[PDB]
Amino acid sequence: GETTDGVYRVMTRRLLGSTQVGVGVMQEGVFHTMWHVTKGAALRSGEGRLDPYWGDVKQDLVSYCGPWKLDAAWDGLSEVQLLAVPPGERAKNIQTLPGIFKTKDGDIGAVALDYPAGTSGSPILDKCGRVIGLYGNGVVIKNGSYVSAITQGKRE
Amino acid sequence: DMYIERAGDITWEKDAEVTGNSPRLDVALDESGDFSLVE
Numbered sequence: 741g742e743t744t745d746g747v748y749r750v751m752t753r754r755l756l757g758s759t760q761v762g763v764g765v766m767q768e769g770v771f772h773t774m775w776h777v778t779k780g781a782a783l784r785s786g787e788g789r790l791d792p793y794w795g796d797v798k799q800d801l802v803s804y805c806g807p808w809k810l811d812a813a814w815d816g817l818s819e820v821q822l823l824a825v826p827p828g829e830r831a832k833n834i835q836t837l838p839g840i841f842k843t844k845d846g847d848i849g850a851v852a853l854d855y856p857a858g859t860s861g862s863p864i865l866d867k868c869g870r871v872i873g874l875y876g877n878g879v880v881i882k883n884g885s886y887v888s889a890i891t892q893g894k895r896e
Numbered sequence: 897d898m899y900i901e902r903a904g905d906i907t908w909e910k911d912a913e914v915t916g917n918s919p920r921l922d923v924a925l926d927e928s929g930d931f932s933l934v935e
């Protein structure tokens with residue numbers, strides 16, 4: 741059904757009323773979200789059906805209709821925008837300067853903003869408007885605050 | 897069954913609300929995609 745590029749809400753009618761479980765990015769005919777949001781299950785877009793194509797639980801990413809299309813990366817210096825799509829609330833751009841997640845396999849960007857769990861999948865953008873990763877998988881620090889990795893897939 | 901609803905365009909907003917800190921954190925990623933804090 742809806743093929744338009746843009747940011748989408750991922751909803752379910754299983755619980756009470758309608759519940760927002762996450763967010764995703766439609767781009768080049770491919771829907772990109774976080775794995776933990778859909779758990780790989782098929783998605784409905786009105787009258788149409790989106791079938792999963794690629795997925796990885798460790799990366800916490802999943803694509804529908806085609807391979808991962810998002811390839812832009814954070815430059816390590818510039819500020820970024822979290823186009824946050826919170827449950828029951830309008831889309832909001834929140835500019836922030838990312839921190840770092842240091843791992844045994846290398847460093848990753850990290851956005852320190854607090855949002856309900858149904859906000860996972862929200863895209864993180866650069867000065868050109870390019871999606872440099874997805875917000876929604878990270879850690880809770882000593883003060884109860886949330887820090888998310890800038891999770892980006894690999895393009896083929 | 898899950899479904900998708902459009903919520904907007906992917907554009908940079910000049911003069912947006914600038915908030916948030918930049919922490920340097922030591923983390924570990926397990927086989928299940930769960931980050932943890934290393935100390």
Ligand SMILES: O=C(NCC(F)F)[C@H](Nc1ccc2c(c1)CNC2)c1cc(Cl)cc(C2CC2)c1
Pocket residue numbers: 776800855856857858859860875876877878879880886928929930
């Ligand atoms: O990033 C998350 N991690 C757990 C948390 F402790 F940080 C969390 N989603 C999540 C849930 C299940 C899995 C994975 C990620 C990956 N592997 C299964 C989340 C995301 C946002 Cl946006 C908000 C919250 C609120 C509660 C703080 C939590």
